[PDB]
From TrEMBL:
<feature type="binding site">
    <location>
        <position position="146"/>
    </location>
    <ligand>
        <name>GDP</name>
    </ligand>
</feature>
<feature type="binding site">
    <location>
        <position position="17"/>
    </location>
    <ligand>
        <name>GDP</name>
    </ligand>
</feature>
<dbReference type="InterPro" id="IPR027417">
    <property type="entry name" value="P-loop_NTPase"/>
</dbReference>
<feature type="binding site">
    <location>
        <position position="16"/>
    </location>
    <ligand>
        <name>GDP</name>
    </ligand>
</feature>
<dbReference type="GO" id="GO:0046404">
    <property type="term" value="F:ATP-dependent polydeoxyribonucleotide 5'-hydroxyl-kinase activity"/>
</dbReference>
<dbReference type="GO" id="GO:0006281">
    <property type="term" value="P:DNA repair"/>
</dbReference>
<dbReference type="Pfam" id="PF13671">
    <property type="entry name" value="AAA_33"/>
</dbReference>
<feature type="binding site">
    <location>
        <position position="18"/>
    </location>
    <ligand>
        <name>GDP</name>
    </ligand>
</feature>
<feature type="binding site">
    <location>
        <position position="15"/>
    </location>
    <ligand>
        <name>GDP</name>
    </ligand>
</feature>
<keyword id="KW-0479">Metal-binding</keyword>
<feature type="binding site">
    <location>
        <position position="13"/>
    </location>
    <ligand>
        <name>GDP</name>
    </ligand>
</feature>
<feature type="binding site">
    <location>
        <position position="14"/>
    </location>
    <ligand>
        <name>GDP</name>
    </ligand>
</feature>
<feature type="binding site">
    <location>
        <position position="149"/>
    </location>
    <ligand>
        <name>GDP</name>
    </ligand>
</feature>
<feature type="binding site">
    <location>
        <position position="103"/>
    </location>
    <ligand>
        <name>GDP</name>
    </ligand>
</feature>
<dbReference type="GO" id="GO:0003690">
    <property type="term" value="F:double-stranded DNA binding"/>
</dbReference>
<dbReference type="GO" id="GO:0046403">
    <property type="term" value="F:polynucleotide 3'-phosphatase activity"/>
</dbReference>
<feature type="binding site">
    <location>
        <position position="17"/>
    </location>
    <ligand>
        <name>Mg(2+)</name>
    </ligand>
</feature>
Length: 172
């Protein structure tokens, strides 16, 4: 089938919303799941089921910061027999700190010097997926930041091409 669950993993300020907003703009048949606008994680799940029932692809724009957080979405993939691909945004804590410092307001409340302190607290819990330890993810792309702060349609195409060159970890 044409559809997938795309799990974004990355720190606050790493660029998850930038990528996901451009993706749904650029490519037919994609919906963005986001809790800071959606309401609750159950509401995210509810919307995800509705979209998968329509055979849509979904991009999970959440930090997806450890194995237990990712399991929600991997279980959903298994139930629907829909593959789970993952993009890990490889911005460092210092890069994200600098970006957060530049926010004046934000739906997450991770803003400015307050936001920097939040990020520091978060680092205790951030456990991105490893190629070895198998969670049921099909492929993992580790995506370097672009020099530019915006995401183009061309970047979206580059990303999907890079993802296609990633080895299959768990076969459908
Ligand atoms: N230089 C650079 N900036 C990015 C990139 N991706 C996002 N940004 C910038 O980093 C900031 C945080 O991005 P955001 O999408 O809000 O991060 P999120 O918290 O992970 O949703 C934004 O100002 C973006 O323009 C990237 O690949 N490279
Ligand atoms: Mg965001």
């Amino acid at each position: 089938m044409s559809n997938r669950i795309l799990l974004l993993v990355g720190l606050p300020g790493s660029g998850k919303s930038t990528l996901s907003k451009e993706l749904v703009k650029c490519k037919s048949g994609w919906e963005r799941i986001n809790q800071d606008d959606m309401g609750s994680r159950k509401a995210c799940e509810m919307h995800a089921k509705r979209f998968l029932n329509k055979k849509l692809s979904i991009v999970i724009d959440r930090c997806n910061f450890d194995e237990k957080q990712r399991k929600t979405w991997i279980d959903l993939g298994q139930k629907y027999n829909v593959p789970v691909d993952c993009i890990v945004l490889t911005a460092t804590e210092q890069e994200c700190s600098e970006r957060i410092q530049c926010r004046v307001d934000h739906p997450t409340g991770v803003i400015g010097d307050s936001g920097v302190q939040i990020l520091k607290r978060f680092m205790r819990n951030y456990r991105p997926p490893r190629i070895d330890q198998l969670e049921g993810i099909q492929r993992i792309l580790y995506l370097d930041p672009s020099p530019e702060p915006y995401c183009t349609p061309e970047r979206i195409d580059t990303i999907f091409h890079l993802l296609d060159q990633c080895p299959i970890l768990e076969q459908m």
